[PDB]
Design a protein around this ligand. Structure first.
Ligand SMILES: [Zn+2]
Length: 258
């Protein structure tokens, strides 16, 4: 059928409808720190989220998305490996049924409890629809979550998740500040890759922050109460909505830091 994370429609099945799933530049990957060399040429990263305008939060049956008004150079990502300006369009997470798994990228094989993806598109292209088709069209900032102290910037999201329990539900979600989801360090790894959900388009410059953020067990448990299923259907808890590591193939992962 259509795609999900189950035994019958999960990542091992995706290539049938989306052959690029077996492509040369698929994400996520394992980051081997011994081989991901420091690159002194990487300009530093500019995460500029002060004018971010959140619009809504919605459960799309795979995760939940927080959508932003990307009509102006409000919330943008620049510098680092990027040429030009990338507008924030949406963020979502991937998480596990147990703390020991849930991230899409891994670092020396370590899996984090969850992974946040802030998705941006290259203003070279006019809108998200054109950008997503081009190898230089997207940049996704990925941030690892580990379980520890509460992330206070995540609480506004956690406290609305009751209202979007099931597939197709959404809610107005204004004045959310994504700066509240960043760690202290902007140190990062970068490589060229893909969307980690169908259609798996190889159009993403990946920027994956070294420093995880901490979130509390209560916060993660609230992610784990969401449903993959639509209302009235049998319960299928939305957990383990991660694709595993894909072959690195001919690519290099470069580190911004020594
Ligand atoms: Zn993602």
């Amino acid at each position: 059928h259509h795609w999900g994370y189950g035994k019958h429609n999960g990542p091992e099945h995706w290539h049938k409808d989306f052959p690029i799933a077996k492509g040369e530049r698929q994400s996520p990957v394992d980051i081997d720190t011994h081989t991901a060399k420091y690159d002194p040429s990487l300009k530093p990263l500019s995460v500029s989220y002060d004018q971010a305008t959140s619009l809504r939060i919605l459960n799309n049956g795979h995760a939940f998305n927080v959508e932003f008004d990307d009509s102006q150079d409000k919330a943008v990502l620049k510098g680092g490996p990027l040429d030009g300006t990338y507008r924030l369009i949406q963020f979502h997470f991937h998480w596990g049924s147990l703390d020991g798994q849930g991230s899409e990228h891994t670092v020396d094989k370590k899996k984090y409890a969850a992974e946040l993806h802030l998705v941006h598109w290259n203003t070279k292209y006019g809108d998200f629809g054109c950008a997503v088709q081009q190898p230089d069209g997207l940049a996704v900032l990925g941030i690892f979550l580990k379980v520890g102290s509460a992330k206070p910037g995540l609480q506004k999201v956690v406290d609305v998740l009751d209202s979007i329990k099931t597939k197709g539900k959404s809610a107005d979600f204004t004045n959310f500040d994504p700066r509240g989801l960043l760690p202290e360090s902007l140190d990062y790894w970068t490589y060229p890759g893909s969307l980690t959900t169908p259609p798996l388009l190889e159009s993403v410059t990946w920027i994956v922050l070294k420093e995880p953020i901490s979130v509390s067990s209560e916060q993660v448990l609230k992610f784990r109460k969401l449903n993959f299923n639509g209302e009235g259907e049998p319960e299928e808890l939305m957990v383990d909505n991660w694709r595993p590591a894909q072959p690195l193939k001919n690519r290099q992962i470069k580190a911004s830091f020594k």
